[PDB]
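Bump. Still looking for DCP2 (NUDT20) structure tokens.
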Amino acid sequence: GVPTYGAIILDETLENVLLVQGYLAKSGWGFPKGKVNKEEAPHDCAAREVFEETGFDIKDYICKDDYIELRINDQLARLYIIPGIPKDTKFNPKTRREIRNIEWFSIEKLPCHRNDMTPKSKLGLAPNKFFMAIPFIRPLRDWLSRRFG
Ligand SMILES: Cc1cc(=O)oc2c(CN(C)C)c(O)ccc12
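Sorry for the wait, here they are.
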């Protein structure tokens, strides 16, 4: 699979993160990210995708050692961690055809797994509008514990 790069943007308090809402197959909330072009560097893909989806340029903020990276069905996804962005920042997707909304969310109130259906005696997971973000929440919390306390 083709690797994807993007960003976990936090506010000044480290309480809140920035999520984007897609359409159709991407109909819930996730971190801004996308597939890398041929010969494009990780950090440049990250800045490009985040800019298309939020109107915020992260080029001069990226720390090349500061990221979280997961494999998800044999696709690599790396999100660079960008702390200290004020909540009064104007965001503005370029691609209005891809992005329905942008909003800040409380990290402690976000879920880190989806719920089962054992109250109903049925296998699988109940739907969750944070499906795309969920895998990154627990790594993010641990990474923040370590780097800050
Ligand atoms: C929209 C856009 C196109 C592109 O190819 O690269 C970008 C980069 C990366 N460097 C500067 C080339 C940005 O930092 C910010 C925006 C873009």
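Residues 1-149 form a domain with the Nucleoside Triphosphate Pyrophosphohydrolase fold (CATH 3.90.79.10).

Edit: fixed formatting.
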